[PDB]
Design an enzyme around this catalytic site. Structure first.
Site, PDB file in Angstrom:
ATOM      1  CD  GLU A 255      -2.932  -1.230   2.232  1.00 10.45           C
ATOM      2  OE1 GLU A 255      -2.454  -1.260   3.381  1.00 10.45           O
ATOM      3  OE2 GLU A 255      -4.157  -1.269   2.008  1.00 10.45           O
ATOM      4  CD  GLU A 331      -3.809  -7.107   2.586  1.00 10.01           C
ATOM      5  OE1 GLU A 331      -4.900  -6.631   2.960  1.00 10.01           O
ATOM      6  OE2 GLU A 331      -2.722  -6.518   2.733  1.00 10.01           O
TER       7      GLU A 331
END
Ligand code: NA
Ligand code: NA
Ligand code: NA
Ligand code: NA
EC number: 3.2.1.23
Lengths: 408, 204
Positions: A255, A331
């Site tokens: 991220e 994820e």
């Protein structure tokens, strides 16, 4: 704080400074070559020797001795302070999460007349990780990643990890048919990797780079002034963990958008360690900085067309024009509380689609902390219970198991 | 535009199309089609025929078309719908989500088919949505997929018009007839009627 071990290490003036192990195979993995590159620091001397021995338990399966001085690599010569031993191993016992066969490599720096100066050692796992024709292969077979993301978290000691908790986690994971773990989102305590070598878990080793809070997310990762810092977090990870067979994939972090620094460090990894794919989800999960399409929370059949970073259906994602890479979700299946609804849809897709090779559930263990009532009774606490403000109240608890490792 | 080559009844289906002694005949059916129809703008795709397996003659004639008229893709469904003799993955009755793993010529889910390792071609069903009688159940699933997936670029329904023929009762009244109503035997009774419209072009 000082939340991992502190040690003193005494080495000789003339020392082993670095050593890399590589394993090369033939088409059917009947023959292997262990290539051990050993580097020294200190005073070079013609009587110095390096012996690399390979052991299967108490049995010496291969050995090699040589003086220092590597082959010529450019116009100025070679590395006088390096040597590469090439050991042959016939019918090696291959490493996998299913059968974690390990050898022991002992690297002896000694004299020609036999005096041992020092010895280092590593566990060696014979396995090949490579992406072929859109599929992630381990020892020639396509993997199906039964993965989970795992933070280093303990409800009482916080981010201090102990061997007992690591072992507990690994056992629970394997007992629940997990074969892979993602180091979300930083290099783990060293012992972790060893245990995963020993018990048989595939590991994604992830650089400690997350800039999620930046606006835009790549403000720093696209800035060359932050390329040095980022580089240190990637390079020093690789240099530490590259000999662990459990580590099958490198990750550039998490991220932090997609900036040129990612491309640079991707290529750096690919140059220094071509034995492992590199993945990175930032910037849409399918950027030039990843060998694997590795989206976060992409759904099986439903598209999520976000501007500039859409989350396609994984099935659709595989078939986009020009796309040939495997897809492994870094994820998915956000286990926040009473959750994991729709998990079977993911696994039906994984089994039906060859290039859908699984993913890493988010996540293993609730990041709750223990507080104490007025009456001394312990209770589990989440964001905001320590006066922390602003806070993301209970989003710290996304685990398949409670912080005490009791299962959900 | 499709060459008049179908050897469906052969066992195996490519017995003739893999035989060089039949390459001349096949060639004439392909070449003379192209030479006739190559100036028509409506013709956007050439087809090497239908249900004749996959033999070397197909590869040869595919390459012949590609050499003489590179302005149009060539497609051919035989031999698994994704052979070297087709620029387009063109399966028959592949389903949207359900795999049909037949030996040697599986009919994958079209969604899955696009993503098979090494596969980059577009997928256009040469036949789908078999409109035999009271049918076309599940058509919307196909069109949802077509719109969601870029490389699912549609297909050709099977088929336009019922192949029924008119017979006449003792009282001179006409009725619609299908396989077996002319003494034809063996016959495939009503499988000739797969149309969206009746033979008189009245819609189903
Ligand atoms: Na799969
Ligand atoms: Na969270
Ligand atoms: Na489409
Ligand atoms: Na028919």
């Amino acid at each position: 704080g000082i939340f991992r071990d502190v040690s003193l290490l005494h080495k000789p003036t003339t020392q082993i400074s670095d050593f890399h192990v590589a394993t090369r195979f033939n088409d059917d993995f009947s023959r292997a070559v262990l290539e051990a590159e050993v580097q020294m620091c200190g005073e070079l001397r013609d009587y110095l020797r390096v012996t690399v021995s390979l052991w299967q338990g108490e049995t010496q399966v291969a050995s090699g001795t040589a003086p220092f001085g590597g082959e010529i690599i450019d116009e100025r010569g070679g590395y006088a302070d390096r040597v590469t031993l090439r050991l042959n191993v016939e019918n090696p016992k291959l490493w996998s999460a299913e059968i974690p066969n390990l050898y022991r490599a002992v690297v002896e720096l000694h004299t020609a007349d036999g005096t041992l100066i020092e010895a280092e050692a590593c566990d060696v796992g014979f396995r090949v990780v490579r992406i072929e024709n859109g599929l992630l292969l381990l020892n020639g077979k396509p993997l199906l990643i039964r993965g989970v993301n795992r933070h280093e978290h303990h409800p009482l000691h916080g981010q201090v990890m102990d061997e007992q908790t690591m072992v507990q986690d690994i056992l629970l994971m394997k007992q629940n048919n997990f074969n892979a773990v993602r180091c979300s989102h930083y290099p783990n305590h060293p012992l972790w990797y060893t245990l995963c070598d020993r018990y048989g878990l595939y590991v994604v080793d992830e650089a400690n780079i997350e800039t999620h809070g930046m606006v835009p997310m790549n403000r720093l990762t696209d800035d060359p002034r932050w390329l040095p810092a980022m580089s240190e977090r990637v390079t020093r990870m690789v240099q530490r963990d590259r000999n662990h067979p459990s580590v099958i994939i490198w990750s550039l972090g998490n991220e932090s958008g997609h900036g040129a620094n990612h491309d640079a460090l991707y290529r750096w990894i690919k140059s220094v360690d071509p034995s492992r794919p590199v993945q990175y989800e930032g910037g849409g999960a399918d950027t030039t900085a990843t060998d694997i399409i590795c989206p976060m929370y992409a759904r099986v059949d439903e598209d999520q067309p976000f501007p500039a970073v859409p989350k396609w259906s994984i099935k659709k994602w595989l078939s986009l024009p020009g796309e040939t890479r495997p897809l492994i979700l870094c994820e998915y299946a956000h286990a926040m509380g009473n959750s994991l609804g729709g998990f079977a849809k993911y696994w039906q897709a994984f089994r039906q689609y060859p290039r859908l090779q699984g993913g890493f559930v988010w996540d293993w263990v609730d990041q709750s902390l223990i507080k104490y009532d007025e009456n001394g009774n312990p209770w589990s606490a989440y964001g905001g219970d320590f006066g922390d403000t602003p806070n993301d109240r209970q989003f710290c608890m996304n685990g398949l198991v409670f912080a005490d490792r009791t299962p959900h």
